Design a protein around this ligand. Sequence first.
Ligand SMILES: Nc1ncnc2c1ncn2[C@@H]1O[C@H](CSCC[C@H](N)C(=O)O)[C@@H](O)[C@H]1O
Ligand SMILES: Nc1ncnc2c1ncn2[C@@H]1O[C@H](CSCC[C@H](N)C(=O)O)[C@@H](O)[C@H]1O
Ligand SMILES: O=c1[nH]c(=O)c2ncn([C@H]3O[C@H](CO)[C@@H](O)[C@H]3O)c2[nH]1
Ligand SMILES: O=c1[nH]c(=O)c2ncn([C@H]3O[C@H](CO)[C@@H](O)[C@H]3O)c2[nH]1
Lengths: 344, 344
Amino acid sequence: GDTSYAKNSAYNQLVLAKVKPVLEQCVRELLRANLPNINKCIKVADLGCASGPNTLLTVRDIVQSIDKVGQLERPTIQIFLNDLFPNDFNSVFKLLPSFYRKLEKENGRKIGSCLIGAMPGSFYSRLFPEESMHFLHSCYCLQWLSQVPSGLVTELIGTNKGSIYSSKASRLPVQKAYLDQFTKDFTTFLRIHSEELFSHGRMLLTCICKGVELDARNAIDLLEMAINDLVVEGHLEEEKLDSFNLPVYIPSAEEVKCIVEEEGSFEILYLETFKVLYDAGFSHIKAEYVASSVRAVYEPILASHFGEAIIPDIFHRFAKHAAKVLPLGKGFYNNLIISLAKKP
Amino acid sequence: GDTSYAKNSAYNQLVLAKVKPVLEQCVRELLRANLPNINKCIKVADLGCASGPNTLLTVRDIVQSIDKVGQLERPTIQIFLNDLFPNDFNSVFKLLPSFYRKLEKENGRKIGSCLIGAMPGSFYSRLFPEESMHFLHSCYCLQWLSQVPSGLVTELIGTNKGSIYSSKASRLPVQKAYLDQFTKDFTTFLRIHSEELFSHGRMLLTCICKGVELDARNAIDLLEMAINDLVVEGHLEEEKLDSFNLPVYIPSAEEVKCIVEEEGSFEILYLETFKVLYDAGFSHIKAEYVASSVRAVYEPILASHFGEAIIPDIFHRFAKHAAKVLPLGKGFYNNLIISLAKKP
Ligand SMILES: Nc1ncnc2c1ncn2[C@@H]1O[C@H](CSCC[C@H](N)C(=O)O)[C@@H](O)[C@H]1O
Ligand SMILES: Nc1ncnc2c1ncn2[C@@H]1O[C@H](CSCC[C@H](N)C(=O)O)[C@@H](O)[C@H]1O
Ligand SMILES: O=c1[nH]c(=O)c2ncn([C@H]3O[C@H](CO)[C@@H](O)[C@H]3O)c2[nH]1
Ligand SMILES: O=c1[nH]c(=O)c2ncn([C@H]3O[C@H](CO)[C@@H](O)[C@H]3O)c2[nH]1
């Protein structure tokens, strides 16, 4: 589709390009760590696999990373694609036949040696039997909380005026509520997924993290500005904004690390941050290209609260704010890659 | 949908009713055979899981059979649903949330202790790592061959006149070509799925098998009659019929057993045959109900060779032939259940 996630990735390919060498070194160390039955079958999942061409590009990179180490007879790889229950697994599955052909042709890997299946559900709950997995990988998912912060939901709400998440501009109780939820969720994710890994198993996480720059503007800041424009210009109802809170938290790298250390199950092997500028994969209606990217992510949740009607409007104003920031290199996400090993 | 598989099962529920006590005794013996890590996690697959309410009813029956033995803390069950790449896994996945709630409510099984995933692909090729599974279950799937018999395809065709499969009325070379393909395919299924099972792991297969009765008429015979009606009455081309061969074989119970013994990987623990009359689930346009059941299964393949147009006509004549045979109890499938243990 014209507006779909499948046709509106490609910034994601630049992220994946950064992850790749970390991934390769991560699996290199994991194959020499010699876990149970690893030279026979390696068991792997991707948590938050989504649906487009990008999902099989991650699998491709994971498989290539494992095969690269072969420099004996290739180990079987069993890969589980995880995502929520309503994800479009059907569209991924239909693409499998040609994908497996590509592997045979381009990679030397015989059909049946790479077994790709799905395990749907929340990655804040158990997905796999205790000590069954060698390697878990997640990219661009951990910003999504299990729920709107429970302080804005169970406690007594529309306390986050003019915003849709916790900015640096947000009131103290708003930041606290979002951090508390992140902390709960990430600690649960770490605990739960350590239980699934054999000892010395590994996780590789790539997450959006807080930018340092003053004047920097991420996609959520730009969205927030876009919606504020519509309330100020009479178009949107303005307690509709105050009652809208994304279930998203963008941590700081320091906050991610503290929680890993507090949780206690994982040793941190590697940590790095990197920016990707929103217009980096492009060729200045590059602002419109960015607006389409963000919409492919945020349209469903936005639509269901604000109505299908104002979305064109949201992403028109969005483009205007993007256009101001791109020429300065101020429109980006900052990112964090972290390699963990399960401690014995 | 009105014509869909999901709304056109219920004969299948009678089959499953017959399978259940065999299933139960099968898993009872399996859990005392004490395979590797079986009291911690039991790994199970349903091969040819399809898409309707029936698919989660099989899962339900498998789970209950495992929990029934607990008469210690419930083992985790990891279940893989397998079917072909284009199957509607999406629709099954959307139902999983309520299904898991049902399990917690009605079964005492806490959420996260039953992990249901999918592994798509043909069950005549490898689906799981070697010696990784405890139990595989297949019902009503083994009729379906890997291809139209290679004799009628690679060799030099339109040799099976006025038929669509191998009847007892079929010429000798037709029966030979179909039996050769069954043998190849079923042998491959056994060999391939033994390799996946731990030693002493189990398979339970429920297959359509040949009826004994003269004058008995299964759904395929009735279809064949319906199509023959249309050529004789000028409606259908009549080399369209002679070039149409289903990739379906209905074996005799003796043929299935001989192949199990020859393949040599499995010990046969239990073998039983049973009939289900096509109108058994019904409180005499019961013939129309049967015709709809059969169409839900055979419409895609019929349509793509004969055209979407004549299908109403096919199933109108079908109903007429069904109506002659149901009052006599001559419209049924005969069925075979076989319990198998992987030999050491
Ligand atoms: N709790 C959860 N469990 C599993 N998936 C989740 C989740 N919360 C969010 N997601 C999924 O996370 C995804 C973020 S987009 C996926 C990014 C992708 N891995 C890439 O690198 O390009 C969405 O598909 C969303 O549905
Ligand atoms: N080679 C193969 N691998 C996996 N599934 C197959 C297959 N050949 C046929 N099938 C599937 O087998 C199914 C038969 S209908 C399913 C019957 C179901 N198990 C029940 O008891 O009610 C179809 O869904 C078809 O798509
Ligand atoms: O804010 C988010 N949240 C996501 O899950 C997510 N997944 C991918 N992306 C990126 O989508 C665009 C790439 O086509 C890019 O602008 C990022 O916002 C995301 N941005
Ligand atoms: O010939 C087949 N082949 C099948 O795969 C199959 N799966 C289910 N059935 C049954 O479908 C009807 C039940 O609603 C019943 O008439 C059987 O044909 C099948 N009949």
